[PDB]
Structure formats: C-alpha cells, structure tokens
Hints:
Shape of chain A: globular
Cytoplasmic side (chain B): 133-145, 205-223, 290-307
Number of helices of chain A: 9
Number of strands of chain A: 2
Bound molecules: the ligand O=C(NCCCN1CCC2(CC1)OCc1ccccc12)[C@H]1CCCN1Cc1ccccc1, oleic acid
Extracellular side (chain B): 168-182, 247-264, 329-343
CATH architecture of chain A: Up-down Bundle
Structural class of chain A: mainly alpha
Subcellular location (chain B): Cell membrane; Cytoplasmic vesicle
Transmembrane segments (chain B): 107-132, 146-167, 183-204, 224-246, 265-289, 308-328, 344-365
Oligomer: homodimer
CATH topology of chain A: Rhopdopsin 7-helix transmembrane proteins
Strand content of chain A: under 5%
Largest interface: A-B, 27 and 26 residues
CATH class of chain A: Mainly Alpha
Distance between the termini of chain A: 41 Å
Number of domains of chain A: 1
Keywords (chain B): Behavior, Cell membrane, Cytoplasmic vesicle, Disulfide bond, G-protein coupled receptor, Glycoprotein, Lipoprotein, Membrane, Palmitate, Phosphoprotein, Receptor, Transducer, Transmembrane, Transmembrane helix
Amino acid sequence: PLGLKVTIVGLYLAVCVGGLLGNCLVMYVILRHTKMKTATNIYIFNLALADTLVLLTLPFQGTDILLGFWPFGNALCKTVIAIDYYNMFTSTFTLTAMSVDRYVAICHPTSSKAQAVNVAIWALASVVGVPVAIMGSAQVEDEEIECLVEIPTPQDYWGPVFAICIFLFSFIVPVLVISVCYSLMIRRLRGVRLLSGSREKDRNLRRITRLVLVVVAVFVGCWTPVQVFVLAQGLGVQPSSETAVAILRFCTALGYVNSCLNPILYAFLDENFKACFR
Amino acid sequence: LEDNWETLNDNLKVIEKADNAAQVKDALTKMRAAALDAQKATPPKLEDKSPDSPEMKDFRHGFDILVGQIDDALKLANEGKVKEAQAAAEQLKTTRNAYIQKYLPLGLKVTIVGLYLAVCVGGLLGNCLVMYVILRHTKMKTATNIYIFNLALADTLVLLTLPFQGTDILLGFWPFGNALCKTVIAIDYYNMFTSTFTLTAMSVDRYVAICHPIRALDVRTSSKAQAVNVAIWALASVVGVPVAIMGSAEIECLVEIPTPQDYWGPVFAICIFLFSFIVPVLVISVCYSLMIRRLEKDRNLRRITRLVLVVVAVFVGCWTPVQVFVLAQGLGVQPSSETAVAILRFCTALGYVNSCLNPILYAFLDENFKACFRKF
Ligand SMILES: O=C(NCCCN1CCC2(CC1)OCc1ccccc12)[C@H]1CCCN1Cc1ccccc1
Ligand SMILES: O=C(NCCCN1CCC2(CC1)OCc1ccccc12)[C@H]1CCCN1Cc1ccccc1
Ligand SMILES: CCCCCCCC/C=C\CCCCCCCC(=O)O
C-alpha cells in the first residue's frame, strides 16, 4: 500500500547511500591507497564495481514503486535492466572465481591474472546482459506504462525456457562449482595442522578462506528467495494478492541489501580492510 | 578404557615374545595395573546403565577373573618357573576374548535386512509400475503426475541401495569400496531433498488450481511441471555432489565433517535440518492454509488435493524421527546402547519404507492409477 511502499523506498535510499559509501571506499582502498592488490582483492574490486552500478539504480526503481509506473523512458529502462542482470551474473561468477582461487591456494601453496578473469567475467555476463537490454523496454500496454523484459511468443514455451536457463546458469551452477571447491579443500585440509607451509602465514589463508565463504553464504542467503520466485513467475505462477506482492517487494529488496552488506563483511573479517577504515 | 585395553594387549604380546624373566614379570605387572584401571571405567555400550546393573556388574567381573590369572601368572614367575608363566599368557588371551571383548544383535539385524529386501522388491515394482503408466501407457501426463514421476524416480534410486546397505548392516563394514560409497551417500541425500522439494512443488501446484482455476489450465501444463523437476534436481545437487565428495570409506561408509567438528557439526546439522525438511514443510503448510481460507466435477480437485496431502503426511511421518535423531547426532548426542542403536536402525528403516508406500497410496486414493493397476 501507500505506507508500506514508502518503507520499501526509504529502505532503498538507506541501502543506496551506505552501499555507495561502503563500496566506493573499498574500491579506493584497493585501487590507489595501497599495494594490497592481491588476487582476492581484485575479485573483491569486481564485486564492489558491480554493487556500485546496481546501487545507482535504486533511486530510479524507488520512484517507479511510488508512482506505479516508469517515468524515465526507454533508454534508462534498458540501462537499468542490463545492470540488474549484469549484477547477478558478475556477482556469482566472481564468487566462483574467488572460490577456485582459494582452493588453488590451499592445495597448490598474481593480480594481473585475477584482473584477466574479471574481464572474462564481464564478457560472459554480457552474453545475457546485452540481449536482455535489447529485449527490455517500457511499454504502455493497458492502463499504465511500465519497464520490463519482453518474452517472445508463445510465452508459455519461452517463459519456462528462459526461466529455467537463467536459474541454472546465473545461480545454481556457479554455486554448485563453489561447493565443489570447498568440499575439496575439506578433504585436503584434514590432517593439516600448521601444515602446508609455515605457521606465520597460514592463519591468513584460513582467514581469507573464511572470508570468501561468508560472502558467498550471505549472497546466496539474500538472493535465493528472489531466484525461486522469479523462477516461479516464469512458469506462470503469478502473485495476485496484497500480501503476495508485499513479500515479493521485500525479497527483491532483501537482495538489493546484499550490495551494501559486503563492505561491512570485509571490515569485520579482513584485517587489512579493518585497518584502512578506523 | 579403549586406552587401557591396548595397554593390556601390548603387555600381553611382550610376554610370550620376551626372552627374559624380567620382561615377563614386568609385562605382567603393567598388564595387571591396567586390568584394575579398566575395571573401574565404563564401556560406551553401557554408559546409560547403573554401576550395579547386571550388564555392568558382569563387566567388572570379567576383570576380576582376569586379574586373578595375572596374579597367578606372577607367582609362577617369582617361584622361578618363568617358562610356564608365558603359558599362562595364552590362558589370558582366552579370558580377554570371551568375557570382556563383547563389551566394546545378530537376529535383530536379520530382521532389518529382511525388511529392506521386502521394501526393495515391492518398492521397485510399485514405482517402476507408476513411472511406466505415466510415461508411455497413457496421456495422463498431468502437472501432478509429472511430479509424482519425480518422486518415483527418486524412490527408485534409493531403493536400489537397500541391498547394499543391507549387507553393510550384516557384515558390520563396507565391502564395496569408495566409488559405491560416494554413489550411495549422494543418492541418499538426493532422495531427501528431491522428495521434499517435489512435495512442495506439488502443494503449490494444488493451491494454484484451487485459487486460480481460470489461469491454472495454461499454467499447469506438464511441460512446466517438467521444468520444475529439473530445477528440483538442480537445487538438490547443491548438496548432493558436495556430500558425495566429502563421503568415503574395520572400514565404513560415512561423511567426513571438517575440523573442528564441534563447530561444523552443528552448522551442517542445523542447516540440513532447516533446508531439507523444515522450510519445505513450512511452505507446504502455507499452501494448504491458504486453500482453507479460500475454500461440475471439482471432486477431482478435491480428490487430487486430498491425495497430495496424504503423501506429505505419510512422508513427514516416516522421516521425522530420523531427522531429529540425525540432528541430535550432529550436536554430539551419540547413542551408546544396544537399544539406542536398535531404535535408530528401525527409524532409519522406517524412512526407507516410505519409498515403497507411495505407489500404494496412489492406488487407493487416485482413480486413474487405481484403474491401470487393475490392468496389471
Ligand atoms: O522488476 C523490476 N525491478 C526489480 C528487479 C529485480 N531483479 C529481477 C531480475 C533478477 C534480479 C532481481 O531476478 C532474478 C535474476 C537471475 C539472474 C539475473 C538477474 C535476476 C522493475 C520495476 C522497477 C524497475 N524495474 C526493473 C526491472 C524490470 C525488468 C527486469 C528486471 C528489472
Ligand atoms: O548410515 C548408513 N545408512 C543410513 C543412511 C540414513 N540416512 C542418513 C542421512 C539422511 C537420510 C537417511 O538422514 C538425515 C538427512 C537430512 C537431509 C538429507 C538426507 C538425510 C550407512 C551404514 C550402512 C549403509 N550406509 C549408507 C550411508 C552412509 C553414509 C551416509 C548416508 C548413507
Ligand atoms: C525515491 C525518490 C522518490 C522520488 C519521487 C518521484 C516524483 C515523481 C513525480 C512526478 C512524476 C510524474 C511523471 C509523469 C510522466 C509520465 C509520462 C512519462 O513518464 O514519459
């Protein structure tokens, strides 16, 4: 309703301000402040960059929720939709990369290469990003103009097709790989007390590995409700009650909250980052 | 006690290996003090019994008779008859195997295995029969039946493992190696997750039919239900494959918890509990609850809805005891009595009985299925 969406928007504004502050701060620290351009941080940079982009759209999406329509035209409609998908894909793919990086460190004890991967990650993402941007538009159909992605005819076929594919390749499979990485660490680590190197430097590996795992946990936690719902919507399951809509609005919000959460996680679970703040 | 037990073995083998009376008299000494420090201890098997219960009292008695022979063996050694003191060691090894060993059944596990064999045969027959009927026999590929197909498929896989698990129970170890160990563990988890997730999907499907009778026709196409099954096996693998990797194989088939176990134990224990069982069931509850408030031949809708609910009920009924126990095991609560183990073995069995139950439910509560089973 009128007051419950004000809640949603106020929530966005909060996420927006804190998010940009946090992520921009992170990007700065890694970029110029210090030579802490490590494999993991270059991937973290990639996450912050993505979060930044999507955070910039909350002000726009926020007004659409209030007005009940899209008053920014087509150009910005396509722009927003692209980012939204770019966000999801670059996030998971980057997390996966970070996970493999971790596993390599643990079992096989450069930033340039991590930088290369980020490129490949944005290259893969665009395979869905650009296409969706083209398909997306703001179409005054009946009653109201609105921003959305157009599903080809018949929708009863392509709906499920894109619904399933995007579910698997944007979320499940990446998460699946991530699981394998950590599972393999587990079997490797067993029997490794202060082993595989020297005491002084091991805690970092453990601490940096612990970091990557929490970020993944937190991400998966924030975007799973939305992923399933969106999946269901693709199959034709549509919400038609105030409560249904509300829950959806909040789970969509809950996902966007993930963007501003990362910086705080780095602050609490990463010594180096914890130092550059205060 | 497991410590003292080995302190007795090494000092029992040092005896008849010795070439000096001093090594014997010394070994018998070490061996004696251990029998006393082990007589006071308590075996795991009887950590739930009183210090004066027959089972417990007759465990400290085994250590009396034993110690008595170690005292005797020492008199021979002191009297100078050192050679026939070694002879007394072969006499001890006997006392060790008969009285105290068992404290570290045959016919009740035969029951368990025979139970598996029964569930296995009937299960496969029932489910395979179901998959056939839906697959080829008829164009009864409805949204609900495509989900039922998914359940049967899962039941089929897990049913195939009962023959294998059944022998492990008999032999008391896993004789099939690692490859099959990993394979079996995966299925077992795949089963649990695929089952609940499918039931949830079926429940939502039902709710949609009840509340959206207009848009359900286009929505509850089998093609879409087919797509869901794919997503269900995709979600399941997020735990299935990882567990397969962690799983491996006296020697036994089990999943390895990372160090420290006192932390990760509860972590996986709680997460698997919530996401494999509770949350799915929670959603299901919402679906029916919403039907309640909302509520030609709608008899089908009612009958098909009634069906889904019974299948859920029966499933939850069969897997709740195990879910809680397994949850408790994750928190460190371990069974250490014959009764404890037995109850666990049967509750684990009870779960596997659920696999063969479904086909019968369809036969009794579904007209269409009830008709084709008459054919065969
Ligand atoms: O709907 C809107 N916002 C919410 C978008 C939420 N997104 C949906 C897409 C997202 C991530 C979360 O869903 C799961 C998933 C898996 C893989 C990639 C991307 C996704 C409308 C109304 C307001 C502005 N407008 C933006 C928009 C329009 C059409 C399509 C997307 C966004
Ligand atoms: O232990 C065994 N069988 C019983 C397996 C019972 N499982 C335990 C796990 C299960 C499902 C039921 O319970 C809770 C739960 C929550 C979520 C998913 C799956 C589960 C051993 C002994 C001999 C055969 N062998 C098979 C096996 C070994 C290790 C792991 C699984 C199976
Ligand atoms: C979260 C920040 C909230 C900002 C509130 C936005 C206020 C918008 C008020 C009036 C906009 C009306 C737009 C009508 C234009 C319709 C035609 C068109 O958009 O091309």
